[PDB]
Amino acid sequence: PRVRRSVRDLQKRYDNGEKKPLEDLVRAWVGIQALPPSDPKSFFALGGYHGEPFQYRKPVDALPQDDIYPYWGGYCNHGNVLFPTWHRMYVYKLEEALQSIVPGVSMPFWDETDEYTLKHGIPSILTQEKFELDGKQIDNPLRSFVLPVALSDRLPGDGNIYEKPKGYVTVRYPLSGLVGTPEALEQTKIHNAKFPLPEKNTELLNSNVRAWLKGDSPTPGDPDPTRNGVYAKYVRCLSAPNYTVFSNTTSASVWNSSNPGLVTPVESPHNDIHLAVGGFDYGGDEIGQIAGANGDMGENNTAGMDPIFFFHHCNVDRMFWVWQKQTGHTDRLDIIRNYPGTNASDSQGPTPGFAPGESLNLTTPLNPFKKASGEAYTSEDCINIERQLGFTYGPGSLDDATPELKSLLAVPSGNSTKKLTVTGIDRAQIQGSFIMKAYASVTDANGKTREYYLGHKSILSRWNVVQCANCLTHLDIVAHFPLSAMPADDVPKAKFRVEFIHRGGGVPSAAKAAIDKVSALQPKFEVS
């Protein structure tokens, strides 16, 4: 049974004399990036499966505003119960291509919650410019990917924000990569000119990733993860009561509207990391509403084209394995039938070959992945990673439940165990990912006022190219926040607010309308 390890581990081993592990990893990645785009083991093909390049439903795209519905032209499952197992298979399938080059090689995980990441950000092997392979200096293949062919719909006369030219290089925070219209490219050029130094950019990113994990501005001593950060949310997720609500944000959201307390699906901190690496400043609501760093990882469209997507998803799979171990679901999973999250119409809408209204279950095929026999993989094929897929997860953060982790999530004596529901944000238009941050102020009769931060919600979403003015996806926003930061007697005095950080329509001609709508929103606040 092969072991997948912490990549920080492979890097320490490299710096201490033992280099074949990191060198094997790099060699295999060089190998798959060099395969041609038409080869289904090429990194371009593999990154392609997630999102773009898309398959369209032209009859749906022409529907009027009252009849149109959202769908997904990529194969990835998001906001549904196939989120964990589809990505499980996806990483496994890219490991298979790596093995094409270097037999027996294992895909490590970026351990997002280890001590190194809390204190120093992303392991440098994922950001370094260069690497020593066969005593030669090569370009580090994990830093980014150059597109061998264009992402293009090849429609004569047309260019949209989905499209990226041949030679396009993937980018992370703080850079922008939306280049398919003249407007987006121009704004991208202006935005990137504000971040011209690669070394400074790497620092900015490491600092944002630490701030996301912490849940507040990074401290220079020991890490001190608060209850609101991505550390806390990954911990909370290992307590999800059942697979259905562990698995996705649609299921967990309705569970949290219908049951006491709060569950966190693994998809939730996973969304957090996307936005962190992919262009959102945790502190962004102290500055403005618009996150202009349109990086590949920040939306599902081209996230799969960035190598770090697989190191991150390797850690997401890890967390799913750990949840399986700690809750005894190593061999069997269950789905609440017809629960929100089990429908192809949920969230991103249906993937290719699915229809509106169609159920999703453990037998549903995880396209486009196929076995040696040519038969479609299903969730049944990949529940026990040791038994059916032939690999395990080495040791890393969070794999044991402990007193320290229990006291992190726990309500300070005399603080509210209640929860806040934010709604009244009905039928908002979706262009790109966005974040919500909730706060509370309380004012005494004597006039003193305290301020409370209640936490964040990351909606990982997509770019959308539509055929009419008002034909974007509509979404009801619903968000639940703990009140644990507040003392219980302040809750009835409280005045709540939310701040959004969003894409502003993707381009400058869409920005003022986006800002006006968000500023106009009058959310409803409900205390349990």
- Give me the residues that bind ligand [O] (CB under 6 A), please: 76, 78, 300, 303
Residue 38 contacts which entry, ligand [O], a copy of itself, Cu ion, none (Cβ below 5-8 A, type-dependent): none
| Binding test (CB under 8 A) with a copy of itself, winner from 115, 129, 158, 476 | 476
Binding map of a copy of itself across residues 343-382, x = CB under 8 A, - = no contact: --x-------xxxxxxx-----------------------
Q: What letter does residue 73 receive in the DSSP assignment?
A: S
The span from the CA of 519 to the CA of 221, in Å, is 38
Q: How far is the CB of 49 from ligand [O] (least distance, A)?
A: 12
Do 170 and 185 touch, CB atoms closer than 8 A? no
Q: How far is the CB of 60 from a copy of itself (least distance, A)?
A: 5
DSSP assignment of 224-248, as one string?
---TTSHHHHHHHHTT-SSHHHHH-
| Residue whose CB is less far from Cu ion, 324 or 461 | 461
Give which of 514, 415, 431 is closest to 466, Cα–Cα: 431
**Residue 316 exposed, middle or buried by CB count within 10 Å (0-12, 13-18, 19+):** buried
Interaction between residue 63 and a copy of itself (CB under 8 A): yes
| Binding test (CB under 8 A) with a copy of itself, winner from 478, 491, 510, 515 | 478
- Asked if residue 274 belongs to a known ligand binding site, the reply is yes
| Residue whose CB is less far from ligand [O], 74 or 396 | 74
| Residue whose CB is less far from ligand [O], 227 or 233 | 233
| Binding test (CB under 8 A) with a copy of itself, winner from 3, 69, 509, 528 | 69
Structure token digits, residue 250? 């649609």
* Sheet with 449-459: strands ordered across: 449-459, 434-443, 495-501
Structure token digits, residue 187? 């704004």
Binding piece for a copy of itself, criterion CB under 8 A, among 174-182, 308-316, 333-341, 497-505: 333-341
Q: How far is the CB of 334 from a copy of itself (least distance, A)?
A: 10
Do you know the residue count of the chain? Answer: 528
The position carrying tokens 């936005």 is: 275
| Binding test (CB under 8 A) with a copy of itself, winner from 65, 217, 417, 528 | 65
| Binding test (CB under 5 A) with Cu ion, winner from 22, 76, 81, 276 | 76
Q: Between the CA atoms of 461, 467, 469 and 470, what dihedral angle is there, to the nearest 10 degrees?
A: -60
| Residue whose CB is less far from ligand [O], 367 or 423 | 367
| Residue whose CB is less far from Cu ion, 89 or 105 | 89
**Site size toward a copy of itself, by CB under 8 A:** 38
Q: What is the 3-state secondary structure (H, E, C) of 269-314?
A: HHHHHHHHHHCCCCCHHHCCCECCCCCHHHCCCCHHHCCHHHHHHH
The span from the CA of 268 to the CA of 237, in Å, is 8
Helix, strand or coil, per DSSP, at residue 429: strand
Q: How far is the CB of 272 from ligand [O] (least distance, A)?
A: 11
| Binding test (CB under 8 A) with a copy of itself, winner from 15, 67, 134, 404 | 67
- Asked if residue 120 belongs to a known ligand binding site, the reply is no
The position carrying tokens 């990391």 is: 273
The span from the CA of 341 to the CA of 44, in Å, is 29
- Asked if residue 474 belongs to a known ligand binding site, the reply is no
Binding to a copy of itself (CB under 8 A) within 440-469 occurs at: none
Instruction: Convert 211-246 to b/e letters by CB count within 10 Å (16 or more is b).
Output: bbbbbeebeeeebebebbbbbbbbbbbbbbebbbbb
| Residue whose CB is less far from a copy of itself, 197 or 355 | 355
- Asked if residue 480 belongs to a known ligand binding site, the reply is no
| Binding test (CB under 8 A) with a copy of itself, winner from 54, 195, 339, 453 | 339
* Annotated binding-site ranges for Cu(2+): 50, 78, 87, 270, 274, 313
Q: Note the residues at the interface with a copy of itself (CB under 8 A).
A: 57, 59-60, 62-70, 250, 253-254, 257-258, 336-340, 345, 353-359, 421, 423, 426-427, 474-476, 478
Catalog residues that contact Cu ion under the rule CB under 5 A.
76
Binding site per annotation, positions: 50, 78, 87, 270, 274, 313
